[PDB]
Design a protein around this ligand. Structure first.
Ligand SMILES: Nc1nc2c(ncn2[C@@H]2O[C@H](COP(=O)(O)OP(=O)(O)OP(=O)(O)O)[C@@H](O)[C@H]2O)c(=O)[nH]1
Ligand SMILES: [Mg+2]
Ligand code: NA
Length: 453
């Protein structure tokens, strides 16, 4: 019986510092390389317990109990308001969450939305009150524990931190939580612990990691979920074709044990795919599976929770955002297909049928672009995953007959088929493509405004 590696989801409002926090722990620069300077996908990173203990050093004694976890699997999530469905997926996967909140800006709309998600999935969480280094006159020392760094601050900075912390505590009370600075908490099951940190300079990461490990272990012990059992269950993050590996999928395995010869069922763009794994490859520890610096290593199995790449025949048509379910018998295959269909079908995007055509590369991207258009009262004709089809172009033309404004296709991280592009040129139907949600929408609006003039 192997010990579970817990999923730690990182949630919070746009720019409050989620990816910077993980980059400081990994010594990576994922945030610097994100297109459009925002997270737009779920990420997964293995942080071995040896790393936790090195960062924490003597502050591991902050937590009475011995930490027996093998490590932590951190799931990064988008803050941008459109990506509600990816924040929900991250919250639903988590054993414990880190709610990142800018101590200077305080609660904002996706802080509140994240809390509602954590309440919905009854996910325990710790709070990272980030960007303390912007308090006036703050004395920065890199990678210093908060309880050491706070001693370097003058009284004005200390008083400003406490004032801002009280604002956060009042906001948590508004939403039904008792919260305090982590070193003042008396009951870690009934109270929310707030760690003041600087993600960018590494202040307070030591105490934050000790609490994450301690509290996630406690959750798993309280639930009797610390031992991993059963066949593998996961969610697909990305579908890729890679030299020497073939068509692969990068996934999060959130329960059970995945083996390199397992039969699996995965969501597909047309229909469910039943295949047998031929290789598993695991990212290096501290490498973000969605933006890796290193090639992955072949492994025979992974135990939950883990990020892993799967090589198997027939994965070219796999659908990102859909389940991967190990299915060792025919009965299991039948069950897995229905569970996959339920997940796919449930993406419900209301369409006005005199509106825009929306295509995207993953289910999470399709939902985000759809949600953002609805918020902007841009009617949606149709929304589906995959490259722009000739049909998509013909449907857009029909809309164009009724209302040229909406006789358009928006393609989020997708390509245009050749016969679709031929027809679109001949019939003068516009197709917008992009890989940054806010820029794709701005491009569609700029085209609308400028055409009217
Ligand atoms: N001064 C300061 N800036 C920070 C800190 N943490 C993050 N930032 C900065 O805030 C900006 C946004 O940081 P990100 O890590 O992308 O924030 P995020 O929460 O992951 O953002 P989204 O994923 O798009 O919601 C960047 O310019 C970071 O350098 C911090 O501790 N101090
Ligand atoms: Mg981010
Ligand atoms: Na950002």
């Amino acid at each position: 019986k192997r010990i579970r590696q817990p999923i730690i989801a990182v949630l919070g409002h746009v720019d409050h510092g989620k990816t910077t926090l993980l980059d400081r722990i990994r010594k990576t620069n994922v945030a610097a390389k994100e297109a459009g300077g925002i997270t737009q996908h779920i990420g997964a990173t293995e942080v071995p317990i040896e790393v936790v203990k090195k960062i924490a050093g003597p502050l591991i004694k902050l937590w009475k109990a011995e930490i027996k976890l093998p490590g932590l699997l951190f799931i990064d999530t988008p803050g941008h308001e459109a990506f509600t469905s990816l924040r929900a997926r991250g919250g639903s996967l988590a054993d414990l969450a880190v709610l990142v909140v800018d101590i200077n800006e305080g609660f904002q709309p996706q802080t509140i939305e994240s809390i509602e998600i954590l309440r919905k999935y009854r996910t325990p969480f710790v709070v990272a009150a980030n960007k303390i280094d912007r308090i006036k006159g703050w004395v920065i020392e890199e990678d210093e524990p908060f309880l050491m760094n706070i001693k370097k601050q003058d009284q004005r900075a200390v008083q400003e931190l406490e004032t801002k912390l009280w604002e956060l505590i009042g906001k948590f009370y508004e939403f039904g939580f008792q919260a305090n600075r982590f070193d003042r908490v008396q009951n870690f099951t009934r109270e929310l612990a707030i760690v003041p940190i600087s993600a960018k300079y590494g202040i307070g990461i030591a105490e934050l990691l000790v609490l994450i490990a301690g509290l996630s272990q406690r959750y798993l012990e309280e639930k009797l979920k610390i031992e991993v059992e059963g066949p593998a269950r996961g969610t697909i993050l990305e579908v890729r074709e890679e030299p020497g590996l073939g068509h692969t999928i990068d996934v999060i395995i959130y329960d059970g044990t995945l083996h390199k010869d397992d039969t699996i069922v995965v969501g597909g763009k047309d229909k469910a795919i039943v295949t047998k794994i031929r290789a598993l490859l695991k990212p290096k520890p501290l490498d973000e599976i969605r933006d890796p610096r290193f090639r992955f290593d072949y492994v025979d199995e992974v135990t939950a929770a883990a990020g892993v790449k799967i090589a198997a025949p027939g994965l070219e048509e796999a659908l990102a955002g859909s389940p991967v379910i190990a299915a060792p018998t025919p009965e299991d295959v039948e069950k897995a297909k229905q569970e996959i269909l339920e997940q796919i079908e449930r993406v419900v995007i209301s369409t006005d049928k005199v509106g825009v055509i929306v295509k995207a590369d993953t289910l999470g991207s399709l939902e985000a672009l759809s949600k953002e258009l609805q918020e902007k009262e841009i009617p949606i004709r149709k929304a589906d995953v995959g490259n722009v089809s000739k049909t998509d172009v013909m449907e857009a033309l029909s809309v164009k007959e009724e209302e040229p404004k909406y006789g358009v296709i928006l393609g989020f991280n997708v390509k245009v088929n050749e016969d679709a592009e031929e027809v679109a040129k001949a019939k003068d139907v516009k197709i917008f493509v992009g890989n940054v949600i806010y820029k794709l929408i701005e491009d569609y609006e700029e085209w609308v405004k400028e055409e009217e003039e």
